């Protein structure tokens, strides 16, 4: 044997590992490495738009801290 | 007394699914009116600040309105923390 069924199962598992993992990595690669922002409501979208406007490079994930208040 | 007992026994022998369904529906109808936490659910719903609390223009005749959030006046969610 019954463990001879295991190899094929393993292959399937490996395939099923690819999507979610990939998504996570891609979500980190295009969002500064910090977990792509979720905007289910218009308040979160407004926060994202303000972040993009004040980033200075048209990228919401470029975060400005207290070093920007001179 | 005995007639209902025999009817319930026959139903449990023949249609257990219907007996369970009717029991669950009856409990769902009855129990909420006897619970003390329904008031707590209503108060929890009322305590969620969806919109901005617009301040009132002071006229010197509101002893029960705070001038600052940390002032003792106004509603308190101290009950909610322990709940």
């Amino acid at each position: 044997m019954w463990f001879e069924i295991l190899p094929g199962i393993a292959v399937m598992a490996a395939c099923l590992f690819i999507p979610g993992m990939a998504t996570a990595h891609i979500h980190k690669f295009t969002n500064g490495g910090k977990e792509k922002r979720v905007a289910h409501f218009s308040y979160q979208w407004n926060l994202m738009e303000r972040d993009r406007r004040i980033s200075g490079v048209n990228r919401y994930h470029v975060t400005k801290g207290l070093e920007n208040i001179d | 007394a005995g007639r209902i007992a025999s009817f319930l026994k026959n139903a449990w022998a023949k249609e257990p699914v219907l007996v369970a369904s009717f029991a669950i529906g009856g409990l769902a109808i009855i129990l909420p009116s006897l619970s003390p936490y329904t008031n707590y659910a209503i108060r929890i719903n009322r305590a969620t600040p969806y919109n901005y609390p617009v301040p009132l223009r002071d006229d010197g005749n509101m002893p029960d309105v705070p001038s600052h959030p940390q002032d003792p006046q106004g509603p308190s969610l101290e009950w909610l923390k322990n709940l």
Partner: protein
Amino acid sequence: MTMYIAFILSTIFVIGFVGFSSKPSPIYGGLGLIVSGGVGCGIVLNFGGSFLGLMVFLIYLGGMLVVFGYTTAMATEMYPEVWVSNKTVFGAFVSGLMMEFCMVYYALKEEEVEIIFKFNGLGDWVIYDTGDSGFFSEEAMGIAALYSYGTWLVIVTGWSLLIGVVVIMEITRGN
């Protein structure tokens, strides 16, 4: 002007309406109505009606499955008609297509009042509201208010549904 996605969707909506209104075999009419339902769902999604569009799509999908079964039961023929197998059906389809073409041309090329009023087009994006607030969706709140504001509506709707079940049972009895 901005990609006129909503205009393309509404044009496909009208095309599907022409498709099922020229009345081919009810299989293809049901297909056209399914297409129109999906595209109208897309339109409403683009205007911010996620729940309403998804619900109308679901409801019409179920209704069209029932309609397909009923067509195979009691609305079939030896050679079911398509839009090109009949002079009448093809003529109606073409007439609807060119009527939509003419209406669109008289709309976006000049300002003319067809039936109700006139306008210039300019794409839907102009007439929006730019409202910036909220931790909820106004559509969801307005729909959920049915159980707190619309008690009367719930009562009449439930009564009509129960009466409709009784009514179909009464009608199909026969004898």
